[PDB]
Amino acid sequence: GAMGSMERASLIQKAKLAEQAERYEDMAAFMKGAVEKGEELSCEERNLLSVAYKNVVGGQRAAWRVLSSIEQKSNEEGSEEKGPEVREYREKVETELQGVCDTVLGLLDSHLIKEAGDAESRVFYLKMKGDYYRYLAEVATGDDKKRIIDSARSAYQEAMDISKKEMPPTNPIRLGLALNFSVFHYEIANSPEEAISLAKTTFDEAMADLHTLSEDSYKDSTLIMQLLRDNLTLWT
């Protein structure tokens, strides 16, 4: 590991600096180094890890979608043959995206999830596992596509089961999990009705629990509730 010689605290400090500089690849490398120190991650550290990789993979996904659109148009009827280059470059970006997902899933499997006992850590990591299998599913086409989809579903489901037993309905991790599992249902599993039902039930159960919260917790929870509503508006 290229970060093996750097102190854990220095990796965390540099991850925060990289974030301020909008250097998300560096941020992710620093946080991978911090995970590989072998100690459990605090709440803030978990979110630094997720922010870094979400920004990296988000850029890869956006690029993949641009290239995939161009490739689809290059294969339509009447289009001029432009050679293998669009497919090759889409494949290059896809392979890099898959590599980032495999890296994140590898950190979760070695050994973040198995050491995560509290709901706030375990649900967070299982949500991440579902998210990164979902990103793999977005690009999957081979014999393993159904197994990739089911790996995402299985991780999200375990996270959901824990979250419903151990967290209040307004907990922002629980809300974000439900938001993302709902999107999985809509965009990956071809289950729009399940996506809409989950988003609506999550929103309504959170609404009923807002009265228990402080001002700052209310802001955290209502932010994610608005995303659930945004998706429901898009889908209905």
Partner: peptide
């Protein structure tokens, strides 16, 4: 695209 976090 729909919102995720």
């Amino acid at each position: 695209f729909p919102a995720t976090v």
